[PDB]
Design a protein around this ligand. Structure first.
Ligand SMILES: C[S@@+](CC[C@H](N)C(=O)[O-])C[C@H]1O[C@@H](n2cnc3c(N)ncnc32)[C@H](O)[C@@H]1O
Ligand SMILES: C[S@@+](CC[C@H](N)C(=O)[O-])C[C@H]1O[C@@H](n2cnc3c(N)ncnc32)[C@H](O)[C@@H]1O
Ligand SMILES: COc1cc2c(cc1O)[C@H](Cc1ccc(O)cc1)NCC2
Ligand SMILES: COc1cc2c(cc1O)[C@H](Cc1ccc(O)cc1)NCC2
Lengths: 349, 349
């Protein structure tokens, strides 16, 4: 239908045939510090490819500038950069989505998050999904012979790379969640299970300094975590024991586990909480239907990552989460959307 | 910047951090024959993930259908498939773009074209663009110590993969080009340089049976080329000599060469043509501005594949092609948009 629409469909089909190049181009530009260079130049700066290349460690800036101008035009057509023309020369500025890959005040961005999925330890795993669907099991396990968190405890390089990737995504999002979710008035001893390096707790204690915090984590994660104020790092296993407190918190944890792991975990929360304790679960809820939206696209990608790394896991619906709580001991359950495609799921005991 | 805009920007930024999973997923689904399976069922058919897995060699259809429903939800988010909910069951149908990856009457689709970009010899090349922007040169040459087309004369597996990739793409578009471009009246002897396996000449000769056709091409390409009536496969080199004809044809050839190579090539064309000869160059022109369109994303994807495989090449504007015509001796130049993001540039002698 329609010649305009039929041409758009042909081009999208061609776009899909070579969509492997977009991650490769995005990573190369980002890791050439191009977004840092445009950003440092000042608020709303517009820099030519020749200007940007002046700051590269290159012995042939002529070739680099002609090469770079091609991939910067690519990022413009994918809405990552803006373009302005001054005498037939193209001047590029940061578009909204690029600011998530510019280092902020502390030097944090989504860069180590994107670079984790492009790691040499993970790249061959994405492309064994056909074998995984047909033969069951896990792509990550097919490639490495050990499951995901188990493998991390054997490779410090990838453990560290994963940890910075979680750390970076957490810092970027918790500022918007903390501003959305006003539910720490009745928190005094917060316990975060599978909290990574510790930044989620630290940022809650920074806005709510009455809170003391415990970070329950596997020991290979907490090995050299920073010594945040009011944060105690505890090395154990949330399927064995959870330290005692009045509130338990879980971000990007519940989605990694099957129903039987999830119930053993919520019963350990129940036993660690007091008669009025509560559990907080920060996660995306499973959408009832996929759709053509970047939220839906973000969610599906996460689903695909989960399939590849921890097949056991799943994104769950409201009804799936409520029933898991009730069987574990909890009485009340609430769902509060807290921005960034994320909910806070409250299991009141 | 509304809160909806700020939310869409975050979700896009998250989509970009994991954009490597989309090629992996589109490939795994295409190679499980899912687009064939839904297509067999009839125009507009909506199948459940369990119906689809009925035709897999899986040995565990239940795990297969769980896993497959996650990746099919992904393709619905990226507008490759449709999803309809019936009695709480998700039924998937083919969206217009997926039709390009369903084998047609002759068994051709963009499947081997996409699969070429995911080849084990091309994959390490895409993710070296930072190293090649800094040091100049070709990522392909850096990975495979020979330039692109010369390596093809050394790797019979990759030669076939590539030749089929070009065969598939030209079959798709050549029907629409011929339908839009009536500039083949008058032509008697058509010489096509870099014609590949020859399906594009064959197709022209099928609607214009009067035309005789020469397919000047590298020996390792025409070695096992098909035999089309009215098409003579000539092993050679367009930079040494182009056989005489009243019309010369180039598709996806010119963009692979720097300005000096194009002048030598156009000189050879000028000397092979009669007083009223003409050269036809089928190629995407360089757009003056990148835009947010699948057209411009397709164009940019190609510019980046160019950087990775043959750095010296370039897409060119009308003024740049005009200047190369004049320098080579041609009298008139014309530009006619055909279809499929392609132009015919006519060099008139
Ligand atoms: C994907 S991460 C989430 C990290 C952090 N919550 C965030 O959102 O950035 C899941 C974390 O849970 C931790 N984890 C997994 N199993 C665990 C267990 N049995 N006991 C303690 N921690 C565990 C992992 O080490 C990992 O860092
Ligand atoms: C990308 S392809 C285009 C194939 C075909 N025109 C199409 O569009 O499907 C470029 C072709 O030009 C051929 N080629 C490259 N250099 C050549 C030369 N010096 N003489 C003849 N053919 C050449 C290559 O073998 C390759 O098949
Ligand atoms: C979006 O990027 C990641 C997100 C997460 C992880 C890894 C990533 O690369 C790991 C494994 C996992 C991923 C997805 C899923 O559905 C379940 C578990 N844990 C939690 C979320
Ligand atoms: C879209 O996919 C391909 C298109 C083409 C080729 C390889 C691909 O993978 C080869 C190398 C090349 C690619 C791009 C470019 O700008 C110049 C040369 N020749 C012509 C067109």
């Amino acid at each position: 239908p329609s010649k305009q629409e039929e041409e758009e469909t042909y081009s999208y089909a061609m776009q899909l045939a070579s969509a492997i190049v977009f991650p490769a181009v995005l990573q190369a530009v980002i890791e050439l510090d191009v977004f840092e260079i445009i950003n440092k130049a000042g608020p709303g700066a517009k820099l030519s490819a020749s200007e940007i290349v002046a700051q590269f460690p290159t012995k042939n800036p002529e070739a680099a500038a002609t090469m770079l101008d091609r991939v910067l035009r690519l990022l413009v057509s994918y809405n990552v950069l803006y373009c302005s023309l001054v005498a037939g020369v193209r001047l590029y500025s940061l578009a909204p989505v690029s600011k998530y890959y510019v280092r902020n005040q502390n030097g944090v961005s989504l860069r180590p998050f994107m670079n984790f999925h492009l790691d040499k330890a993970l790249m061959p795993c994405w492309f064994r999904l056909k074998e995984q669907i047909l033969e069951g099991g896990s792509a990550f396990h097919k490639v490495h012979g050990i499951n995901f968190y188990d493998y991390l405890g054997t490779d410090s390089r990838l453990n560290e790379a994963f940890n910075i990737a979680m750390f970076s995504q957490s810092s970027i999002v918790m500022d918007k969640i903390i501003e959305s979710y006003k539910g720490f008035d009745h928190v005094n001893q917060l316990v975060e299970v599978g909290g990574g390096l510790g930044i989620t707790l630290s940022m809650i204690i920074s806005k709510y300094p009455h809170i003391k915090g415990i970070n329950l984590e596997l020991p290979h994660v907490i090995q050299d975590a920073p010594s945040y104020p009011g944060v105690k790092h505890v090395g154990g296993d949330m399927f064995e024991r959870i330290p005692e407190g009045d509130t338990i918190l879980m971000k990007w944890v519940f989605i990694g586990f099957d129903d039987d792991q999830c119930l053993r975990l919520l019963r350990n929360c129940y036993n660690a909480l007091p008669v009025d304790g509560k559990v907080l679960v920060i996660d995306t809820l499973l959408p009832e239907v996929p759709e053509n939206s970047s939220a839906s696209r973000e969610t599906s990608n996460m689903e695909a990552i989960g399939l590849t790394l921890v097949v056991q896991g799943k994104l769950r619906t409201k009804q799936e989460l409520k029933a898991l709580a009730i069987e574990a001991g909890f009485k009340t359950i609430n769902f509060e959307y807290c921005a960034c495609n994320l909910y806070v799921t409250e299991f009141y005991k």
